[PDB]
Design a protein around this ligand. Sequence first.
Ligand SMILES: O=C1N=C(NCc2cccs2)S/C1=C/c1ccc2ncccc2c1
Ligand SMILES: [Mg+2]
Lengths: 295, 257
Amino acid sequence: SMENFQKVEKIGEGTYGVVYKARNKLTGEVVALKKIRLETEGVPSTAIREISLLKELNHPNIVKLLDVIHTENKLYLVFEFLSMDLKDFMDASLTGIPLPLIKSYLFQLLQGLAFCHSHRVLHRDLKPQNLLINTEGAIKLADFGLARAFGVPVRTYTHEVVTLWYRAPEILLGCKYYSTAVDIWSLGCIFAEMVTRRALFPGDSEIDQLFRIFRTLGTPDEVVWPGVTSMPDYKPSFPKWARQDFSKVVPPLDEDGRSLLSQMLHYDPNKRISAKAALAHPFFQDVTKPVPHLR
Amino acid sequence: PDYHEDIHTYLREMEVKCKPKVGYMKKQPDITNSMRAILVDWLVEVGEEYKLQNETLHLAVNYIDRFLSSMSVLRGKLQLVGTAAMLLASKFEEIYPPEVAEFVYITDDTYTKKQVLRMEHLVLKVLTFDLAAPTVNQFLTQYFLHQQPANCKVESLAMFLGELSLIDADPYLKYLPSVIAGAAFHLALYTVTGQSWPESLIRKTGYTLESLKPCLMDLHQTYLKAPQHAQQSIREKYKNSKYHGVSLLNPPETLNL
Ligand SMILES: O=C1N=C(NCc2cccs2)S/C1=C/c1ccc2ncccc2c1
Ligand SMILES: [Mg+2]
């Protein structure tokens, strides 16, 4: 039961349920509690999926699930507590996030992500709000409520997926198959956001999102993305925007930074860099582990 | 191709950890193999009625066998375990799972909603929320990538044969999904094209024909005897054009090796 946990404060909602900060009254441990009220449709698929996958995934860059508690009107997930989410951190930072910290965070996220993909898990909601950081310099993937265990090869999965700003063009154009590449696209957007301090593609709708991506990466054609003109939601009326220099997209980034980002934001999912391959990109040659020096 | 090897290795790890107890039915006081066969055949019908993925069918059976491996159940409650298992599998695997009310409907007024919901919680507690189980299907789709070239009749027959193995705990509960999938694929490929388990899969899996023989011999018998089997929902399912009517094909009388 929740006799031993003292609720400190509500910190937000994400994907499903409400996340609280709490304290174990006996051990002192600070934890995060995700509450689920049992829509009487039983335990929700989002809870079912997050729990079995998070129990499979032990990695320094994936959030640690500590316990699962049922108090037969609710279901609690008990996580380790870190400091704050990456969105919190970026709103607080005038100052900027220094490059060595960006490199380090990106490096860790790719490790967390390669671990997911190697273990047949799509996260499908990678965004700053779902990435968690501590005082020591670590960053972890969290909120696996939209995740799933995929097969090889993939079949058609839920089309809803990924919050708009971070949503890969293959989902937007309605491809019947999507896979691991969609998590890479999302990390690309986050990479850019850490550097620019603003979201890369802040669309208010699907078409707005597509147009914002096109005005940065060029409208795709059959040479750059074989098959694209045949996709269900591709329209021949799409305006034809020219591709722009990556030195203009993320100006502070040096040669390797730009190279990695363009490989992460490649239109063709099959040609888009894997998280595993990205770990060896020369961008990371001088990677360290600085502290965020947050509060 | 990226992650395919890692995923295969990892699935080969998890099938061992997700394996039910081989001789649990002996320790079940009130239920039998035949009763479980009735239950599994019914799940096939449910899957057909609600147009569910085969993967969901396989997941449910794994949940059932793992649950029955630690909990004694009376014959009258076996179907409740089954219904709750199918519901969870649907929530795990399906884009659009059926509502709980639909699961209460196909029980035929046998159990109540509250009973189904409580059974869901019990199965979860007993399985400790570990629902991402490797299945025969998950290996089959991987094995299909080694065809030269892809043959749709071979795939359907493999899926068919792999599905038949779900019905009979004797002898298939002693074989891993990766092994049943191996035997199903070779047997399928041999029936349609006259070819055998390929060198490229020996490479990938490390299973040879010699290693698959024990399972392959059992599956050959089940296949030959499938029309006389008391449970028939799988033969009727794979009669349909959706699966290229592969259940209507003639099984071979010898396998050579
Ligand atoms: O923070 C978490 N967020 C989840 N879903 C999305 C949300 C982000 C922020 C509010 S809701 S699940 C989750 C678990 C968790 C674990 C440790 C934490 N440490 C510090 C701050 C938030 C934490 C959240
Ligand atoms: Mg018995």
